[PDB]
């Protein structure tokens, strides 16, 4: 269902603040979604 999208450099905490897409689609586990 959810797995790593790419290295930690592409997904950051900034995404969990304004980027809804990253939280669910671009960041499967990194943004603390899965």
From Swiss-Prot:
Q: According to the lineage, what is the superkingdom?
A: Eukaryota
Q: Which compartments does it reside in?
A: Secreted; Nematocyst
List S-S links within the chain: 2-34, 11-27, 16-31
List residues of the ShKT domain. Answer: 2-34
Please outline what the protein is used for in biotech or industry.
As a specific Kv1.1/KCNA1 blocker, may be beneficial for treating Kv1.1/KCNA1 gain-of-function-related neurological disorders, specifically pharmaco-resistant multifocal epilepsy occurring in infants.
Q: Where is this site: Key residue for binding Kv1.1/KCNA1 (occludes the channel pore like a cork in a bottle), and important for the voltage-dependence of peptide dissociation?
A: 23
Family under the similarity heading: Belongs to the sea anemone type 1 potassium channel toxin family. Type 1a subfamily.
Misc. comment: Very weakly blocks potassium channels Kv1.2/KCNA1 (Ki=2.24 uM) and Kv1.3/KCNA3 (Ki=1.23 uM). Very weakly blocks potassium channel heterotetramers formed by 1 Kv1.1/KCNA1 and 3 Kv1.2/KCNA2. Does not block Kv1.5/KCNA5, Kv7.2/KCNQ2 and the heterotetramer formed by Kv7.2 and Kv7.3 (KCNQ2/KCNQ3).
Q: What does this protein do?
A: Specifically, dose-dependently and potently blocks the voltage-gated potassium channel Kv1.1/KCNA1 (Ki=1.6 pM). Moderately blocks potassium channel heterotetramers formed by 3 subunits of Kv1.1/KCNA1 and 1 subunit of Kv1.2/KCNA2 (Ki=56 nM) and weakly blocks those formed by 2 subunits of Kv1.1/KCNA1 and 2 subunits of Kv1.2/KCNA2 (Ki=14 nM).
UniProt-recorded name of the protein: Kappa-actitoxin-Aer3a
Specify the species. Anemonia erythraea (Sea anemone)
Its lineage reads: Eukaryota, Metazoa, Cnidaria, Anthozoa, Hexacorallia
């Amino acid at each position: 269902a959810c797995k790593d999208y790419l290295p930690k450099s592409e997904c950051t905490q900034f995404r969990c603040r304004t980027s809804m897409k990253y939280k669910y689609t671009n960041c499967k586990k990194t943004c603390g979604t899965c």
